Write a protein that binds this ligand. Structure first.
Ligand SMILES: Nc1nc2c(ncn2[C@@H]2O[C@H](COP(=O)(O)OP(=O)(O)OP(=O)(O)O)[C@@H](O)[C@H]2O)c(=O)[nH]1
Ligand SMILES: O=C(O)c1ncccc1S
Ligand SMILES: [Mn+2]
Ligand SMILES: [Mn+2]
Ligand SMILES: [Mn+2]
Ligand code: NA
Length: 614
């Protein structure tokens, strides 16, 4: 862009650019960079090119400073340990700004909305002014041009993220497609403006904990969809600071999707091939901590079946002119929960993460390896453990429960051959599910599209234990009014040509009276996928129940599993389901209230009626 006029010398930041050129940026990109440089007052501006050289030297620099540590047991892997105050998404500090609250969340009948957190324009302006002015003093502002989705995909969207965090730059290189080719692709087109600061201008006003810059007290993750802006302050945790990951991927994108006729969802996408050489793509929405990444990367136990991964967390889906629901993974890597990852639960992740991977908040072994609860593999005698709190550790956990790996998707040994195809992959089934220790069978199939949207809406999951509502696995992620999101989903049925995928609901987590899992899960979930596959093909493998279709007796391949109690696992109790429908009723009435579509109320009535006839 052109240099700003000025009567002095404070508006043109060209002299502070240490990589790239403001003159070579598209005009609106310059305005965005320079405007926020004027506000935040960085010492330098670094326009990222996405090169390996850039990445390597950035990592070595963070290593110099003791912000990250190299994990010498592996190939170009690194470890970051955070301030324990900055370890996860903070829902109560995550907001969406719109002129009217109702555009962001439905106005609940009696209670406080659980479906979003609206902040008024006025309150945000005040919050912004109390945080950003001068916030990058002494620091580099990195400019990260990135694509969500394969570059030039009709489904891809571009952002520009400004950050003062080299951790964010590195992790964004993994999780998005970033650098100079994106700027060239963008040209004078539209982009999402993403502004991030850790909120710790130099000289530091407060002590740095574990060399991890953050400002917990002023942490605020804001989304301004009508301005195409994401503005995040105070947190370096990836869900808050890698603005592609959730802010763009789900919150802003779900609104774009609403406006433009597509869907942005908290879904893995996998391809599954059967022993007759037929392949189908499925998407699945489970809440956080409910096993999407395991499913997405599944190593199936059934001989002759293959699973390949398109993505593990976000799906952007659009019906094409032929009526196929075409999906892309708009991400470039996996940002996956480390604890519980083992050769038993996710052998393909174990494979993936030993090269070119950044770990955050896991334990470190004395030989430069990684450790966490549930890794389920022993250390040689001699090898010792430093916890994620940077203390010597022996059996508090050694790793934070939301510690994660950040790894390139291209390295997954079962990455799908079409995982970067710009036209996307055709989704033939959508799976919902969560943690239900009681009452909910292993798998059922919705009766219709409308029933299936109700099934998404009615999702609940265990957090004494609390069973929480998490509709579509989107509860913390809706970019706009959920009622209107339901209507948008329902509207897909009225597209002539649309080939509506079959909708299923699974429960890997049903327990017997002793608290033991009824179902072995993991690779054994391939048997559930086989049933779904056949159902999509039209097989006569279902029996009707009040909640939807379930597998016929003998329909599920249980060879290996005579130990498994199909009776308790597929049991449907009138008493449980009477209570279930009442809770769903109460929830939807309060939380969706005047914006609850007729079709969803109708499905509630119908389920009530079917249960009444038991
Ligand atoms: N019993 C059982 N537990 C499973 C299964 N699949 C995954 N899990 C559990 O799910 C948890 C791991 O899931 P996460 O990686 O936290 O889930 P996610 O959906 O990818 O979460 P986000 O990345 O936060 O969106 C661990 O507690 C696993 O043991 C299964 O088939 N059976
Ligand atoms: O909480 C989430 O679902 C999540 N998922 C993937 C990666 C990061 C986060 S914050
Ligand atoms: Mn997630
Ligand atoms: Mn995951
Ligand atoms: Mn309808
Ligand atoms: Na640290």
């Amino acid at each position: 862009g052109s240099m700003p006029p000025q009567l002095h010398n404070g508006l043109d930041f060209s002299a502070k650019v240490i990589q790239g050129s403001l003159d070579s940026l598209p005009q609106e990109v310059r305005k965005f960079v320079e405007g926020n440089a004027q506000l935040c007052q960085p010492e330098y501006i670094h326009i990222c090119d996405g090169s390996e050289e850039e990445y390597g030297r950035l990592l070595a620099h963070m290593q110099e400073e003791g912000v990250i540590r190299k994990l010498k047991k592996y190939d170009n892997c690194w470890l970051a340990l955070t301030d324990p105050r900055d370890v996860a998404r903070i829902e109560s500090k995550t907001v969406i700004i719109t002129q009217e609250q109702r555009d962001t969340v439905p106005i609940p009948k009696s209670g406080q909305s659980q479906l979003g957190r609206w902040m008024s324009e006025e309150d945000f302006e005040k919050a912004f002014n109390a945080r950003f002015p001068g916030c990058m003093k002494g620091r580099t502002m990195y400019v990260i041009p990135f694509s969500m989705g394969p570059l030039g995909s009709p489904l891809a969207k571009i952002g520009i993220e400004l950050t003062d965090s080299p951790y964010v730059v590195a992790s964004m290189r993994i999780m998005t497609r970033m650098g100079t080719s994106v700027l060239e692709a963008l040209g004078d087109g539209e982009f999402i403006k993403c502004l991030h600061s850790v909120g710790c201008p130099l000289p530091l006003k407060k002590p740095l904990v574990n060399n991890w810059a953050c400002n917990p007290e002023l942490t605020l993750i804001a989304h301004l969809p009508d301005r195409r802006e994401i503005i995040s302050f105070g947190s370096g945790y990836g869900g808050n600071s890698l603005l592609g990951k959730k802010c763009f991927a789900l919150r802003i994108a779900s609104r774009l999707a609403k406006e433009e006729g597509w869907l942005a969802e908290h879904m893995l996408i996998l391809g599954i091939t059967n022993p007759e050489g037929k392949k189908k793509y499925l998407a699945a929405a489970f809440p956080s901590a409910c096993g999407k990444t395991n499913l997405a990367m599944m190593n199936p136990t059934l001989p002759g079946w293959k699973v390949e991964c398109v993505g593990d967390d976000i799906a952007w889906m659009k019906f094409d002119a032929q009526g196929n629901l075409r999906a892309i993974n708009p991400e470039n890597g996996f940002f996956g929960v480390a604890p519980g990852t083992s050769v038993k639960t996710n052998p393909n992740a174990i494979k993936t993460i030993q090269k070119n991977t950044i770990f955050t908040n896991v334990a470190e072994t004395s030989d430069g390896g990684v450790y966490w609860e549930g890794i389920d593999e022993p250390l040689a005698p001699g090898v010792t453990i430093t916890s994620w709190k940077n203390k010597e550790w022996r059996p508090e956990p050694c790793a934070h429960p939301n510690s994660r790996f950040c790894t390139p998707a291209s390295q997954c040994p079962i990455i799908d051959p079409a995982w970067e195809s710009p036209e996307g992959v055709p989704i033939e089934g959508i799976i919902f599910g969560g943690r239900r220790p009681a009452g909910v069978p292993l798998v059922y199939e919705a009766l219709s599209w409308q029933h299936g949207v109700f099934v998404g809406a009615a999702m609940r999951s265990e957090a004494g234990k609390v069973i929480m509502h998490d509709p579509f696995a989107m509860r913390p992620f809706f970019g706009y009014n959920f009622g209107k999101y339901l209507a948008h989903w329902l509207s897909m049925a009225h597209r002539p040509a649309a080939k509506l995928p079959k909708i299923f609901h699974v429960n890997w987590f049903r327990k017997d009276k002793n608290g033991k899992f009824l179902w072995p899960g993991f690779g054994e979930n391939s048997r559930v996928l086989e049933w779904m596959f056949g159902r999509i093909e039209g097989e006569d493998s279902a029996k009707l129940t009040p909640i939807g279709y379930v597998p016929k007796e003998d329909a599920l391949n249980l060879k290996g599993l005579g130990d498994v109690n199909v009776e308790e696992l597929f049991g449907i109790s009138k008493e449980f389901w009477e209570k279930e429908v009442e809770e769903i009723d109460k929830y939807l009435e309060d939380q969706v209230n005047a914006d609850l579509p007729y079709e969803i109320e109708r499905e509630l009535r119908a389920l009530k009626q079917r249960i009444s006839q038991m």
